[PDB]
Amino acid sequence: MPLAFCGTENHSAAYRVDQGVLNNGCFVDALNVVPHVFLLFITFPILFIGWGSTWLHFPGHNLRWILTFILLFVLVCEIAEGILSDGVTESRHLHLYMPAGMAFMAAITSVVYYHNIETSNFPKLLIALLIYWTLAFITKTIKFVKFYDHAIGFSQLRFCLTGLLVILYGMLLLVEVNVIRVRRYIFFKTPEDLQDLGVRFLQPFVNLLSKGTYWWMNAFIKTAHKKPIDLRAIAKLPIAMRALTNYQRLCVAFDAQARKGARAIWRALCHAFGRRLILSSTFRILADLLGFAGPLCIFGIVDHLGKEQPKTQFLGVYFVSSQEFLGNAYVLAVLLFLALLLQRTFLQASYYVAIETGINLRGAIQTKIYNKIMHMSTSNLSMGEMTAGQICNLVAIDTNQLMWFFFLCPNLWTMPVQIIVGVILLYYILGVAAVIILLAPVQYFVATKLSQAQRTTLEHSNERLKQTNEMLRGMKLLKLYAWESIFCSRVEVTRRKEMTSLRAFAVYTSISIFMNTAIPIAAVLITFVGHVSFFKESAFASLSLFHILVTPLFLLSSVVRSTVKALVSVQKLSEFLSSAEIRECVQIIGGFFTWTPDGIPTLSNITIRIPRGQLTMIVGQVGCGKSSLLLATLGEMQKVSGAVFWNSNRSRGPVAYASQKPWLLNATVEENITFESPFNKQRYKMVIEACSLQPDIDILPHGDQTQIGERGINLSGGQRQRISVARALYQQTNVVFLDDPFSALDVHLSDHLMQAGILELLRDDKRTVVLVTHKLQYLPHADWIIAMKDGTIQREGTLKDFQRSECQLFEHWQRAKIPWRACTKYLSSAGILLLSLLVFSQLLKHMVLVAIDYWLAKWTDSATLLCSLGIVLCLVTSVTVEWTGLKVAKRLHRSLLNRIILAPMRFFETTPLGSILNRFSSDCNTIDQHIPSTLECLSRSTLLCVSALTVISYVTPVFLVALLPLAVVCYFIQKYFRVASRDLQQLDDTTQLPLVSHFAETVEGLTTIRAFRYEARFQQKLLEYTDSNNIASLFLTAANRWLEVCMEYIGACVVLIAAATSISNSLHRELSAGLVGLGLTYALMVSNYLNWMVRNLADMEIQLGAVKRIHALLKTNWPDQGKIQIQNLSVRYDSSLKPVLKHVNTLISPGQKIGICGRTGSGKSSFSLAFFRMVDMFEGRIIIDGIDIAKLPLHTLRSRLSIILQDPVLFSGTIRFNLDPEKKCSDSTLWEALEIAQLKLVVKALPGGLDAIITEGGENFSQGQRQLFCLARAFVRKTSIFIMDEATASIDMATENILQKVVMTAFADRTVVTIAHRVHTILSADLVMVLKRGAILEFDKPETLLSQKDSVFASFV
């Protein structure tokens, strides 16, 4: 029984070459063999030469790929047909399936060949492929015309298949010769060079296999596991994705639409992105339809295999009828497999095209927003209407969610089509669905109530977090007076109010999961119960349809919510976009200028001229239009009437300017000094000298490298005014405007040195200046002054004019992860009595869903109360999850508060408040309102997945042999993808932060930037920020889609193997395919349960990482003697190299209020810190009124001994709560204190009295009211001693009032120990001690020994 080529029968009569060679119907297949094996036998060594930087794709090549692939599809179909025809027959006969296998391999090799000839630019070498393609087109055309001569027609299948690849090969031969015409290589006598030089990200210019499967990502992601992904490793982002380019295209769209509001933005967005958005929607519709084809193949397979030879015979050859073709079993399985392997590639492509269009929308619209910042007026009507928070929330939230809307925009095209086709094929499947079509509005109303509760919850917990910030800012002051507990109680009360709100949030979000996971069960139950009781007419395919319908509905509910937010956002930006713009030597003639663009000119009759070569000191009344006139010269006022001659020694030059309000960019201080200018040491040193900035630089621990301004080193107002003057002065300009720099700079000697340096700089540059201020010490002397009285110019001339206008009278006046810490979370959070119930209910629910699936299979074979148990268990699990997360967050919150209470003040000195507040608030929010739902979703998704692989292994008990490599591959793919995705996620966050940082620093100092006309550099910084955000966003997106392709093909192979082994055991061993079919419907859902599994697993990784930060914060009658004799108590902090206090055996006598101030460099502050027993006094002996002060409860010791401070602060609350909240002793003591200290005329003038709100520090009480509250605590806490510190900045009368209050404290308490680096006012005392260079050097029990000795008087001089 050997291998006959055509067939052995009739004594070699099929080998009869008589009656023509071509009229033999088997010999033509042998003719069709020739071109395919010819191309193989001429192109394998070539390919091996191939096997042994610059790319150019050939012209007209997309149709090559689609014709080659669709010919792969029909050639696989002819492989199936050849096997099905040669197998049920008596012979072998081997002429049905020898040509197709080499043809399949030939198509594979000719596309590898076309790829290897596209990689290497050598166009004269595709002559072989084209002469091949023409030869095979001719040969199958001959076969088809002889099939036509035998008059077969379309009834038999092989006629149709042959005609299909005839027109296939003809049309793709025509593609080849169109390329021949274009590139003109063979018979003609006679590129992406821009796309060459650039970026790493070559996904839009790569072959189709890498466009589909993200093959180029592979070498990236495998590179990413060894070394991390720096920003330099990220691409340069090519021209087609440059934000400027999309912005130009969009502005052309704007101009075309606006030549021919909300509809304008709508039309503009549609015109700029519809040809891709529509392409994305088209791919999405095709993916929906090929998803919706699946169940037809499963139903057909099970019906024909339950059906338990072909009729036609033309010329002795058996042709399979087409109904029997599409009625076959194995053929439909292979078709199902190839349909899934193409469906689940178009879905990812649709995702990606929507994402790419979204990133270009974000780019162009952010660029447009910033361009219309660059022309927006900074008025008190323009900026006075809309603050910077409005425009910051606009940019951030609006543009990101408009992007998320154009993410969800094809969904609003498909989920309706999804629902309609679901209803249609559910009627074809089950005969004569409203429940499942009623589960998207359930999600809509539940999400609506959830978002309302979340809004209210967030704006309540915002007040809770603000109170916590106000209770964590004064940590040292409240711990010093032992006043932590009352603020902890007011926090725990606000926390429990927020906890009631969070319980309502969790209820309304448990019900979404419950409705989400119990609507299909009731839908199927009502469906089949109708089918039996109400219908009585006649399954697993229907269940799979139930899955395919269930998935879009909740997404569509979110789409509708996003649509509403998008419409509101476009309304917001349209009402924003039509606000007032700005506009289109010195001389101003007509004089009318206002802010509102009509009516009430705010500055009129202005006829003032200031030509070049000048130094104008200006003067005027208080707010008489000085900054208004300066900005009006700058062209920043709506000038109604007048003209502006303008000539720099008609275009404007770089006028330096400095507004009344200072401004500093959140950058380095030298970067905030140089301001995008080259750096020379001389002028920089001169400006640091003139503005006295070298002591200011030394006042900072980095100086010219510290992150100045907001989000960094907190500066002072005089420092910021001086920094602004330095940045204004350095920029090397032909004019200089100084609008009162020494107004806020109250340092007179600094101001005088600055005035002299200003004269020197403006005198040594020979450039015009204009200084508008009230410093009249020099302004009427040697300036060309100009005075604006009542908003008008009086005289711009010499000093004799001010001696002629009654103005001198005023001048005469790695990568480790969760499970240890995650185990600690679940253990310390839950308690096993609810964790066990949660895991048991989840496992039981999934066992019930498996069981009801098997019961559905058996009843369908033979042609309820488990779906009810399922719904109840789903409700139970959703309740248990939300309840467990709520209790978890509650007890963790109280734990965080308790560990923050039991802390030393040295940690607050060490660690910033930002770390404690950040890992408090953001991680508490994450482990309170975001982590439990994701945990529940993971615990439902991976358990559905483990269930599904259990079902596949149960149906086909041979599957597990193929499970082990699939799980190994999934484990390795999970590992390498996790390694890339975590780092890329952090790179996304740390790149999306500086763009909105730029929008803050732009919106703050806008008029200075628009004053310099130095917009293009910030334009480049904006475009750089937008590019650095977009490249990370596109790589994160494309990594997600590549993940989904790789894991989803792993799942597809699982489906194929499971179905194959189940069908193999059901053809012969008769597996009773219901157990097999129920396996298959989990095999289809595996394909996306893995999807949900992988994406949610990454999210579970990142959020449990901030629990790590949580673990890090979990890791760490009245004494009236005053006779505490310290006996040699030596102090240390790290006990490393330098103790400060040494051997100080010093006593404060009763009455002898020893105010002991010393040397401020070495021994002043350390003793002042160590005075409250709040530091490590490493030796000696410290008695306190004869008691042991080294082993006492420090809460009781620090409660009843008041002090004063250097930088005092008032805790906000009731006035009795601001005085003594824990005590609340008596009203008359508070009247005596708050009368006799200070602020009696504010307390009695307060609206409430002792029960009035301390308005966040006493915002309009006094500044001496802080010291008054200190004295209140001194009079209230039975405090004989009162340790006082000096005022940092105060008035001399304020220091005298503090001294008078200290005199009253001496008259009433008489115990005090004060240190003051202001030694010349610290002389009113009783005893003193000077402890210089860390010793007991001087002690003066009379006050005259300080004034008697040399050095103490030298410190007193």
Residue numbers in the entry: 1 to 52, 63 to 200, 207 to 276, 283 to 330, 335 to 458, 464 to 569, 576 to 621, 678 to 742, ...
Q: What are the paper's exact sentences on this?
A:
Further, as an additional control we determined the structure of channels without any pharmacochaperone or ATP (referred to as the apo state). Of note, a dominant inward-facing conformation in the absence of ligand was also observed in another ABC transporter, the multidrug resistance protein MRP1. These observations suggest the closed channel conformation is the most stable for the apo state under our experimental conditions (i.e. no ATP and no exogenous PIP2, a lipid required for KATP channel opening [Nichols, 2006]). Here, in both the RPG/ATP and CBZ/ATP structures, we observe strong and distinctly shaped cryo-EM densities within the same GBC binding pocket. Such density is absent in the ATP-only and the apo structures, supporting assignment as the pharmacochaperone ligand. By contrast, the KNt cryoEM density is absent in the apo structure, suggesting that when no ATP is bound to Kir6.2, KNt has little residence time in the ABC core central cavity. The fact that despite not seeing KNt, the Kir6.2 channel is still closed in the dominant class structure is likely due to loss of endogenous PIP2 during purification.
Uniquely, the sulfonylurea receptors SUR1 and SUR2 lack transport activity per se but instead are devoted to forming the ATP-sensitive potassium (KATP) channels, wherein four SUR.x subunits form a complex with four subunits of an inwardly rectifying potassium channel, Kir6.1 or Kir6.2. KATP channels are gated by intracellular ATP and ADP, key features which enable them to regulate membrane excitability according to the energetic state of the cell. In pancreatic β-cells, KATP channels composed of SUR1 and Kir6.2 couple glucose metabolism to insulin secretion.
